[PDB]
Amino acid sequence: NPFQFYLTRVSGVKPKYNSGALHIKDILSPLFGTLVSSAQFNYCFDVDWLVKQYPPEFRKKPILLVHGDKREAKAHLHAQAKPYENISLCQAKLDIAFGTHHTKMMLLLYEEGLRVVIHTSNLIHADWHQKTQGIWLSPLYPRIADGTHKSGESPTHFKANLISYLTAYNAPSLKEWIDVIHKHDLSETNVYLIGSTPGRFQGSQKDNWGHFRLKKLLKDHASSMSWPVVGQFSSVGSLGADESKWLCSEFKESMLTLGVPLYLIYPSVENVRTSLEGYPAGGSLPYSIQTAEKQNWLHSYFHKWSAETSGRSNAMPHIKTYMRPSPDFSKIAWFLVTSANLSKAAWGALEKNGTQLMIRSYELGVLFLPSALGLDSFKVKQKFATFPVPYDLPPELYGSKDRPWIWNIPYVKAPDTHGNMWVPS
């Protein structure tokens, strides 16, 4: 398996659907290596739950929490962590407003080497229970022989890209992790790192982050050949008064680069209502009425969540994926799993028009490029050399009575799976 792309375990589906899936307990297990230290980058944390996901033998080993919390929320997280002597925290500077530290990554240092995990789940019980989530597992990276001179770099430049990503934080405790990475051989890595980092970027630096990073990687490492772009996510930024402000202009332009139908997959009310969680799935799908009412044009790009291929049509998506299928969806030019939702905050927007890219948040993803495997395209694995696309193709359009799930309005005409209504406030 050259991909090492996985879904999380979903509670309440048949065991056959969890056979190739991983729980956080699986990732942290002694079978994955003899843990010495770990860093956990995320947005939301439940420290008590988190510490229990580590096996008993590893629970006292040092853990770093990399979060973006401020003020009182910062205090609460510190309070939450206080009991656990072995836990430190690193607050990621969020200088631009409406930015979040959204990246989901684990750095796992073991006796036998190093592992990097990039995924889509918050570190809270609910994100790993009945959600469709994604995970990329690096190989076990060996330590570089104390007597030798080598870069430990891959053809995808992953090691140097991860180090730059970590460097942008400008944080003391990450420098230690940067130095651990320096010591290790990451040359077997076959994915490309796509990061977002808060700032305003100019010159050659435009290419470093966000969708421009993607544009660049697709220019240099894909080739040209009516191939649709598919984008799938769980949160929706304010995109502008029409598609030309951002969506089809700079964002789709980046996505269509190589060497055009746009499908966007976002759960409908109906998807959420009849899900395994019911309406409380929508607590993880924060599309507000305020933002939605500003951009009604967007919703005609919207397609339902369907995932019979992976038995997860009723496990609401918290995964975020972007890809470029052929016209019949039998193959793809590339695949991206990432923390980046459909927002300017996450992907970046052009300022002082043309000259500046403005990114608000920290985001991280891995891009699977056929060229990194020596191929021209991947075949889509129909039932979750052939990439495991975790939802159904082609994506199905919203029916005329469907609406996008919007989290802050009531749904009281029909009960959900659990016979409840949804009344926010």
């Binding site: 947005y43 939301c44 944390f45 979060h67 919390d69 809270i124 609910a126 607590g283 993880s284 924060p286």
Partner: peptide, 5 residues
Amino acid sequence: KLNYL
């Protein structure tokens, strides 16, 4: 932050 809410 313990969740989005």
